[model samples]
Target chain A: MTRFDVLTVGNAIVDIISRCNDQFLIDNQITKAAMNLIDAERAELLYSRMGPALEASGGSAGNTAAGVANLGGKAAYFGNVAADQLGDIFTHDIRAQGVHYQTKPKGAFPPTARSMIFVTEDGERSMNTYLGACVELGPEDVEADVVADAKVTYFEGYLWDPPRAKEAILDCARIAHQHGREMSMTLSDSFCVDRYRGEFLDLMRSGKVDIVFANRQEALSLYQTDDFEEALNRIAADCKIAAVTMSENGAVILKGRERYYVNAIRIREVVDTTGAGDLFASGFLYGYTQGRSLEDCGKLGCLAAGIVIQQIGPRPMTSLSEAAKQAGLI
Target chain B: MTRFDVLTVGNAIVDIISRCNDQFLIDNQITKAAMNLIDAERAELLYSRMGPALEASGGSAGNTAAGVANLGGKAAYFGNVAADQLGDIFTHDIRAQGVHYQTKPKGAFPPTARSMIFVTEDGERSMNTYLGACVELGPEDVEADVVADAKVTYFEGYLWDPPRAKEAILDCARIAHQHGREMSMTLSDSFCVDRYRGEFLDLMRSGKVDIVFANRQEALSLYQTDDFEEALNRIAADCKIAAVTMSENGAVILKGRERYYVNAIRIREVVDTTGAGDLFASGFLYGYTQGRSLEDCGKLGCLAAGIVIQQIGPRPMTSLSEAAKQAGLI
Candidate 1:
């Protein structure tokens, strides 16, 4: 009954990844391993100070959709971008990855959103995001049929920052549930969770969010706890299904009292950790839509996360399905 | 007095690099390890068919200029680009490498030039270029002061296809010589050399071109000989200084009767061969302008070429000066 296995809704972002050392971060007064929201003026000044960068299309849910499609799942995405060159690049790249991206670019708005990510030697990425036309996404932009025509409608917590986009997410969530489709959300970042803890908790407790994805930091922040066990217990009691990721330590999946622990695939070299969490969501959701076991879903999540961290950007350079087969996971 | 070590003029290009295998070339009817000119229509078709690519600023002479800058030499670039997004990316990247770029973008012309490069597993690259706004380059666009201010004016033979750009190169050459500066030219590709063999030979023999840079294939194609020795001997007689690169075997630097053979530094892994010849020219020109020994120039050339072939794009990702120091070439 659905055309898409996963339909992701969030910011349409072009990530400009530059490799810099820890010293560069201190000199520029940038916080390492965090995403800072910058205005247009600051975006230009920061870009001028940054070194040579490689550009790639990336957003939390956008990357999730790209990963799902890369894993040979039918994926679709809804996001806002201006009718500009960067917007065209985002469209071309996402569509080329076999994801259905049909959001018409807004001509009257600002340019497409861009995240200037500074990747340090330790593979940790510090992002400075300038939300341009992504702010234009609102409740009206959410397609009812597209929401209905998806097995899992996924969105990111970062979209909650833009007031209008928050409404769009709520609208999509409503429509997805209206058609008996499952809905999912990722705690985009610990900082993002801190900004909208109340609303996110309300959304989860209301039984609208069927599946919840988070990393250790996000889970700890969500439960207001310093202990990982306490956060895991709270997440298990709150959500129908919860997948919590711990870097290198792998991930933990919880369904009521049922628990499954998945080991992180050993990555020989960590090139950049920009899209690890997004890709993990990609594999998990892909497996979930295919009616695979929860254990298999967690394994797929860890495998996908492992592959992306070995590259400069968020997207995987290798075919996810082929990689899965090589690891004997598929 | 020369303000810049090297000033390069050519098409300002954005390289969209995609990794593929030998099968992709045959399926697309593309020749391996060659540069092919395609129309705008074909460019779009090819891009849609290709996998996701990483965008980087890459023109033969542009890479050379960037290399000179990265090697702690003052470098300037003269090229045509449209006032578009890709143009902005190209501008930011080259200038970020410390190369001075002052080419004005044409508003009425076609979008910036783009080369679709498919890098096979063997690190060999097959390029399909769409000239676009690069075709707008003419003699009138050449800045007399910029040319005269440079120690060497370098250009690529690929510009010969665009009649107007061809005139611009000739004008720059005349102006460079008029101001007592050296002029350098690169046989961009074997097919390119084949197309402008007579003009390139005339340019070298008539003293308009002071240095010639070519790879083994281009060198062989230039003299219309299958014999490597015949091509090397012919080049030795024709130009003032001819730097001929033989992949893995190293480079031969010919200065009239004097010849310096430099061994190619062993590359542990070859990622992509897109910018090998350009970076070689970068190293040689940077060294030549610094008054280094011809042997050192050939060594620097090999060092720069070796570093680039170990990466994806045609531009140096690391500081060539630091790399040279590590190799004890500097």
Candidate 2:
């Protein structure tokens, strides 16, 4: 029944990405290099003041799902959107990437979810998301057949914000595990980890999640400690397979009694770091579902992440499989 | 009576830029390195088949107007758009760049104009524009006071496509000349030159146009010759001042018996060549209005063109005036 390599669930969002100066972010009280939650009222004000933007479909797991498909993997995705132009764009973009997306548009009342990402000259992006249409997503929207058919069922920790989305994730996890599939999730942000540390740790330790992905700041915040060595050891004990990314320092992978590290590919210029973490998970999960070696999987993940950060958007504009093969890492 | 440095007119368009390979262009029968006109039906068809795009404000003279303003010149623009989200974007983007814009949006029956720009790996962009709301433009929409108050009135040759827009360009030219202002126009494309060679030559030779801007292809096409040397000599004899750009071979400027040559700025990588010629005109016109030397004018023009080609979008993401000051061009 494992027809799909990975099934990703996320809060569907359209990124209205605008470039701005650091002063504009400071004046608006935006936290640098972090995703800030804003209401509809503030979203309009911020959007009006910002310069012209480039709109694209972007949500953490949506990027992962699209990236997996770009890597020649069979990927399916579940996310809710409104029946508007933005929603149409989101739905068409993911499907165009060859991802099996089966989520339907809810309505146009609250409109589609919008992430106002303000990118600075230094290529750092500070985001503000208005989770409008995503707020209505629940367990009813989950596609059980796709979930059970996927070799790996993946989710974003950002889903934990909405109470009903939490229910959908649990439902997805239960169905995935019942079918003898693997469950994976990424700690979306350091703040997200702060908000759901106890619950996240419980889910991983209770065998509900088989694999976990997190960045340096998130891994440090997960155990509420400053030392990464301590964080890695705790993550190894709780997570069946833990993959922790340390920015330019590379990634550390842990399994059972084994440990490995892979260096990050040097980029000449880091244009936008919007989807670095999400795309890394894409290459890693795509390799894992293919039963590749863990070190090779880390290499693939690093390669994909390196490709995305050098461009403007989160999705891979080129074929990941071609790049991996060219790098001699496939 | 001159209150503004420049006033530009063109078909207002929102560019939907998508990265594609050469095969996609061939598959769709698109001519590489040319702006192809498509209807509403084909626009929707091509757009649906293309990958996810990044939308930005881009019309030939619109980019020039925005570029002039970005270079710290007082610029004004006149173009037609529909009462749609795309129209709103075009309006906001130019205004944010500090260019005075006063075109009211018409009804959204046909919607705003859209240019589907497909960029290839070699940085060549083949575009297909749907005129849409621009088809309704007429001489009545021209702002007489702004035209009369500007030092230079610039027009894009693409406006010649719509019969009524051509009337608007002539009306603006008449008003500017009546107020002792200079008139300029760019041969927007080689095909555009082919479409209006007789009328364009008449406009240039009859003292209606004081300055002209054109790239290598358009210049060669204007005279219907293969040799650029013969074309440049003819252009120098007919036009008051001619600025002809020759890609990597640099640019040639001619006025009376004086000739100046400016080398193209060496770019590490040419990402997109969408607005290279337009921004060149922007810098050239900005220098001319300030009474700078013709050599300095060409230098500014080349500098501006170099900056835009290194990025994805047509507009400058950084301050062009600061870049010029640093290069000691101003």
Candidate 3:
């Protein structure tokens, strides 16, 4: 019914990552492996002095958009960026990857948001973010036609940081349902899910969201369930399709009566854990867009997640066509 | 005299690096092999959709300070950062590396600067930088006693970015001369030489700068000479010691009537070229500060440069004892 296969919406933030030893965390009064939100001052102060950083383009929804485009599906993205150099980079990178993004940029702000990433020797990324101009994404920024034109309208829960971004997410959900397109959302971080559990519950149960993506911790946090199966039982009653990912342990896909347990594709190394769940959703959605079976969708999700984990950043399936063919995606 | 070997000053910025094909340059509309400055806005935009970034702690003077400290010498640094997260990182990384950085951070400014580094398959790093708050380093920010105490006050000519950083550099030079300490300056880049040829020539000719560091292109550019040997001849007339680097061609060190041509260490591969020059300076400075021969200093510089070019980032020589032993530094 629509020209686009999927349209993803989220904050367009740059990631600045630096390596730190264990002593760095202990001395600086930082908790290892936690995602902390710092003010503009703190973000700048810490990142400027950290060891040299490796930058990669990262955003929960942006990864999904790239994955869709890489799979030869038409995809669109909606996000806010300040009219700054990094904003220009955001536009250029997505477009180069073949994802369409046409948001009206803010004329002025602090800068596009950036998350200061601290990668430890073990390759875990601990994030400290300053929202910056991501707060610019409000209801007014969402376009009805843009959301309605896609087969699935996807959003990230991290957009809830700024209240206006939540409104934008809601606006997108309504427009998607209005045009009978599927509405999906990824509970971005476990900490983030903890912040919006009530609203997320309402969205899932009210049938406003069709599919939900969450990691083991985020899924369990969203429903406040003690056990994995309890979280699954709770999620199954609400959303039409649920993809619950467990790192290394694989994923569980539930659809009303049937459920698929997908194992993770074995990886040689896990460089950084920044985008594992995001890429998993990308693979699953790519499979769904291709009219693959629910079980096959789970397998594809595992394959994509496996490939990105091996590299430094969230690369698309362009390099994995051969891997996917071996795993039978072709 | 205060107990220290060298004092360094420059911007404290994080480096985010990625590998891309040549098309990445066209896709991002960036000129290859040129450096571009970015505002806060542009930093965010480009980063949002950038590929996986590798982080390293970098700033020309910051790298030198760390290198000096890593070589078992006492060094202190002067720079400005917002009281932000990245700033804390910059400060902590230097301090942990054993360099003293006790400057009072600026409360009012954008976050620290960031360099978006793209290394093509050919191993050249084309840098796009957003100077951010590095502009705040002014004359008063320099610790006079620190410069006076060290045997050498080393500055990169590229510090001419913010008008104030130059004032700070001049102050450090004056303090070093007043205390009977030598002042050394790296004609940092050929492009940098192109930008500030006049001020640099004056610094060299005035006899205030005791040591001059330059690569062949930079030395040639500064003197506007066509042949590398001509630039060396001109440099020898004005400075006490001049170290002219020639990448894989090793380096030439001229002091009084004696000149030493040291060979570069052969490497298996040239992975990334971001810090090869800085590492060479570190090795030479470390050797120079330790009262080694001019030939030994050039040899150490070449060895350090060769070792770092084989890796992705500017790394410390973990096996320093072994490396120095191999170079006959003992």
Candidate 4:
């Protein structure tokens, strides 16, 4: 057995979350429900205008890694953070969640990356992300041994923007394939897919990626079609296994000739929609590594994603393992 | 008109809040629903073991200052925080709420004070505070002109723990009295009152403190009486105006030969009870400074406290002024 159940690599960020109305987004010229990259000066301006915020550690793959740890899974993460205060908080929160995060901080680099997450009343989140020291993560930062030992190496598509981090993900994928470990990637956001569609499609066809995760819109964009079945057919032809999530319609999983559908877990309220996809990956990967049925994996994904949307942050506040147990998914 | 409506002095702390179970508390030897002071080493150990936390600015008097600002009152705060990252977060959060916090950080002192607040499932919070840089606040830090310019100079009894801050509060109280401004103080925690009973009683009877705020337990402990009426009589005879809060039962106000009672505003749920009393002072002082009736002031206090206890942090998430207006208090 490998030393780790799952290994995830991506940006490490401190989320500054505050509640706002729809008018605030219009007033600030912020795109609703999308992640926008901002410079340091823009981050400063946005934060100055934002109301009092609660700071939490969050990143695309980082949240997935933390979610895996919360489910009693052995997980490790590789990312970059500046040797600064927000960096310390980011490191502490993930480590406390039982995930192994040992990436060293660069003192000369910019401050740690931060996302100004504005969660509106309807549970939609508008994110302005500043990729500070996260830009420094490169192939040199990816440990080949760690990747080779894990059952799966997972990454986020957002890493593509950092250029160097994208190179690092490719390195991990290569090492994972060489070591007979599966490689998984989440199409982080539809906008992210739109930016690197050709490269992502090439990655899927290159056979280096075994598993792929995407939401409904991202799946549609990937195949350049409006029909969900056409997109499903296109992905099924390219990837061994894929999980596609739809907000309330639930998630559908495709593996070889088998198709599985699991309904989204019903939550009394949806407080924030920040980490739905990341946590879905967490539950699916945990079940996949445990050699569970694809349907159970989809169910686990729905359960984990369900638990997170009821709260303000991306990570789970309750024990995911306990939640899974109560749902009879284990 | 005074330069400010309310000026507050106390510890400046960054609260690290997490949700935990009752068993977790027992396992860690923490007293549920109470505040404990921990050393730097212990703070580090506890933080490593606790679950992921949300960082926010919270201190007894500091919350009141933030509340006053949130209610559209002129508020200024004087406290101590180290020149560090957490200190910067504390400063930004309070200032973002429109509260003026101008206390300089001490480079030579310890890092910013932090309270590791473990809120259980039932909404009770167990707080472990590391009084880092808060110990540096002294008489010199208290600007007499600022205190004299405010309608009320408010402080918390927790200042007594730092020794020097206790002296600073005394200096502010003296300046407020000399300038004919009212001095208000919260008994903070029941345990805090237990520690400084003699000094708190002396300040109240010496005619220096015009308004006193306390919860039911703190009021009982202050006068060494279990009888509610006895404790009420003791405080009513000692201070010009006193507000005693009884959880669920609401609060009772005592003035010379006059008594008023206000029912606690019913909340949909109680998520956390960290800053109930502190915010009560904010509403009462704001209403008093605006020349509202004492009953209206007590009602305002209940409204503010009601809004906060339903949330997870010390600060109000909604507009307190709007909340008051909706309730027809203003």
Candidate 5:
């Protein structure tokens, strides 16, 4: 048996979130609901023109690690942040959530990773990310023992941006499978899927990625099809299990011929939908490792995503474990 | 002709706000309702032990300046921050609110000022501040033209922590009086007042400060008296105006033989009461510069403060300018 239920890997980033009108996005040439990879110069220019912002710890898979920990799962995370103020902030927040973070960065010159997430009044967000020291992540940084000790090694497709982190993911997947552990990943966003559709398909078809997570948009984009069922069937054929999520329509789990579906939890008011997919992965993996039913796993995923969407940031401020019990889901 | 309604000066700080339980305070020996000054090492230690945090622009006078601008007034601000990320965040937020920010920094080593504001479940906050580059603020940074061209030049007593900022406050007071403009100060906190009681009293009695803002806790500690009437009389005799705020009980404005009182605003729920005083000063000064009555100014102050306490952070997320007209207070 593995010590960690889920081991997450991705960029370590602090999200500088702000609210702006729809016109502000148009003025800045920001594509709403798109995660745009930006350089240092672009990051500075956009930040200078953005509205009042609040900084919080965030990264696709990093957020999942925190959610897993909050759901009473032993989650370990691997990411890189430079030794600086924002790095300290990222480290403190994840560690505060009781996640095992095992990566130390060296210099402060390159600084930490940051994403400027500009959310419009319509409760949608556009992202501008500066990878910074995330580019330094490579196979050398991967800990083999930790990978082997995790029941499921999960990562985000955003890791494809930093070429070295791409190698690091390969290294992690190698050891995780060697130790008889399952490997999983989220097709983070539609754009990310657009960038790595071929390689992601390669990983799944080669049996390197056992479980695949994707929102309906990402799944539809991955197969390059307008039909949702066509994309779902194609994804299910590639991986042992596929979890397909739709915003209000809930999630469907495809495990061979057996299919399990659960409804999405209703939110009173959707404040921001920045990390709904990340938190869904958190619940699904946590439940899967705990030997929970497929339907209950989807419920847990829905429960966590529901809480985060009603709040401003990607991570939940409340106790997910407590919330699950209170909601009669656990 | 005056070009600006208010000129505000203080340390430019970003607050890393996080939630904690009451026992967490007792464990850390953090005195509730106190503004505790800490060094870099202490700040690091406290941040390491604190829960997940979010950074937002927050300084006593900085909040007031933003509020003044949001209330449809031309507010200029003079505060020093280093050439760093946190500094950029502080500068962007204030300017985004349409406040005139005219200060910049040279180096990045010392970094920007930060406050670790820990809030308990009871909707109260305790602060731990590290004045990194804030100590660089001096009389040279104060703009004489802006101070003289403003209706009211205001600052916070927290400026006393940074000795040079203390000198800067004196310089502003000199130019403010020369231009026949009003100078105001807020007794920031009970703990801060205890640290500089003698000098604070000197400022009020010597006519350096034309107006003073204080909460009931700070007012009670200022004169070391529990009786509100005695403190009110003593304070009214010194400054041209004394505005004393009591949480829930509302506020009382003392100006010579006249006193105007405003009722405590009704809130759906009080989330965090961190910057109630700073925001109160914003409304009062904005209304005063507009030549509103003392009673209306107090009402304006109450309205701004009521909105802030009902939410997180020290500043208002919603448009105070819109709220004022909608509430028929303008």
Candidate 6:
């Protein structure tokens, strides 16, 4: 058996999250429902003028890797960071979590990427990201042997930011399939799906992808349909397994003829929704990788999402391993 | 008038301080008084097996920078960091306090420096530092105009660790004096003073140094005399002003036939005394740079030092300007 249960590859982002009221969003001309992208100049201006921030290591794939490790599973992460301050944090923190981080820190290309998360009183986070150094992640950054060692090679759709990172993702997917390991992919966000729908559809149809994780909005946006069930039905035929999360209504899982509807876990209070989808994937993947039954996988996904939404950002669940055992997974 | 009040230059050390009983030190054959030096191998071995740490941005010079800023004075700092995680924290925190940080981060050399600060219950701290990548700080890292712009160019005694950093400190001192600005040095620890006593004495006598800040132990050791009064008397003629601190006994200011023994502010509890000397210098320098009276300078020093020793580390005196004003220092 390989050392890592899951090998994750994506951009390593340090989220500089600040507390904001609803009025600040309108004042700054930020989108209410979109992950607004800002260049370096604007990002610096906002960060300097902004109030205090709560910084944490996060990227869609990084969170998933941390989740796997916290769930008593071995995880390895591959990503790029500039040899700058944030890059050091990204590398050290990931390594501290017992995840294998082997990618080199970029010397000249771009600065480390940062996400400005503005969390409103209502718990909505409007992100303004300066993709500074994340663009430097290229195909050479990924190690083929590292990818081939894992049972599952996972990637995030946000890898499409830099052309090189996209190529790197595809190359890893190709290698995983060739090495007889399963390749799982998260659509990342609805906006991401909208940005790379054509390429994503190709990946699914070419049989390069086995498991897909996407929320209702992302899946609906991917298939250009408003109906969640219709979009869910569309993605499952080609992918061997599909986990379509539908927010508070819970999620729908479909694989060939097997299908189950999992209710959303009752949240005590929803603080921030930045990593709800990532944790949903965490719960689903935790089950899928451990050979859990389909209904149980859906239950775990719902349970994980419930615990995550109660907190701010995509953080590792402290009670996950014990929770898994309590849920009869162990 | 200069734009900034003080500019500090030195190694940025991540102090991994832990409180250990005397038995632990005895078991390890560690000395209680000396700053036990360690290489990377030894430091890693010790830290891996040591207790949980209280990590803080600590360096003799770094503490002074934070202290100066805390005393309602404008401050800036310069230091090198490898492109790594601890490097990021070391950089962000000092710069976060509104210090003008112009030092170019070392592209690659050593990992960031880490000091294992072992504190005894009596509030004495014994340090074991692996000056890791701090050796990368060379004379080339100094910016002439930046040094020239500050009112005081402060150098940490820890510079003696890296030969290149020592050269840079002397070079900056020369540039500061040439520009009619003041050059100040902290006789960091007693061990540090003994290590470079001859060179330190030369710096004081040559008219390149103006104000000297040293604790009683370091000053006494530097003068090769057991008497604190004798050490204070000797340095009076060597430097323009000498501010020597005596912890709970207060401090003594020696300048041209004038010696004032300022009583310490009554502190009810003695906490971790990590940055006691640094903050004392901060208050003294704040008074000096603002052209306060000598008696007032000693009082400021006493007050600041008193406030810090009651806390764990160099604390965030968020309202330092107000504290200074409240202490009746305009």
Please provide, for model 5 over A37-119, each residue's C-alpha lDDT reduced to its tens digit, 9 standing for 90 to 100: 89989988998888778899999999999999999999999999999878988999999888998798968968899999988
Cα displacement (Å) at residue A93, model 1: 1.4
For residue B37, give model 6's deviation from the true position in Å: 6.4
* Alpha carbon deviation, residue A25, candidate 5 (Å): 1.9
The global C-alpha lDDT for each of the candidates, from Candidate 1 onward, is: 0.90, 0.89, 0.78, 0.90, 0.90, 0.78
Candidate 5 lDDT over B22-76, as tens digits, reads: 8988998888868889999999899889888888999899999999998999999
Tell me the tens digit of each residue's lDDT in model 4 across B68-176.
Answer: 9999899999989988778878888889988878899878368899999999888888999999999889988987779989999998889999968878887887899
DockQ of 4: 0.77
For residue A11, what is the lDDT in candidate 3?
79
Better model by DockQ: candidate 1 vs candidate 3: 1
Q: Rank the candidates by TM-score, best first.
A: 5, 1, 4, 2, 3, 6
> In candidate 1, what are the lDDT values of residues A1-330, reduced to their tens digit?
579999999989999888898988898888888778999999999989888777888888899999999998999999999987688778888898999888887683688999999998899999999999998899778878889899999999998888699888888888898899999999998999999999888889998898999999999999889999999988899889999999999999999999999999988999889999999999999999999999999999999999999987888988999998888877
What TM-score does chain B alone reach in each candidate, compared with the true chain B?
A: 0.98, 0.98, 0.94, 0.98, 0.98, 0.95
lDDT of 1 by residue, B1-330 (tens): 568889998888999889988998999999899998999899989988888777888888888899999999999998888898788888888899988888888783699999999998888999999988998889878888899899999998988988699888889988898899999899999999988899999999999899999999999999889999999889989999999999999999998789899999887999899999999999999899999999999999999999999887788777789999988887
State the displacement of the C-alpha of residue A10, model 4, in Å, after optimal TM-score superposition.
1.2
DockQ values, each candidate: 0.67, 0.45, 0.17, 0.77, 0.79, 0.08
Q: Give a tens-digit lDDT track for model 3, residues B221-283.
A: 988889877888888987889998988889999987779999988878888877777778778
Q: Return the interface RMSD of the candidates, in order shown, one decimal each.
A: 1.2, 1.9, 6.5, 1.2, 1.2, 5.7
Better of 1 and 2 by lDDT: 1
> How many clashing residue pairs are found in candidate 1?
0
Query: Candidate 6: which stretches are off by over 4 Å?
Result: A1-3, A12-58, A78-96, A100-149, A164-183, A197-284, A291-330, B12-63, B66-72, B78-97, B101-153, B164-194, B197-330
What are the per-model numbers of colliding residue pairs?
0, 0, 58, 0, 0, 2
> How high is the TM-score of chain A in each model?
0.98, 0.98, 0.95, 0.98, 0.98, 0.95
Computed on C-alpha atoms, the DockQ of candidate 5 is 0.79
A192-284 in candidate 6: lDDT tens per residue?
889999988888888878889988778989999988668877898868888888888898888997889889876777778777777777777
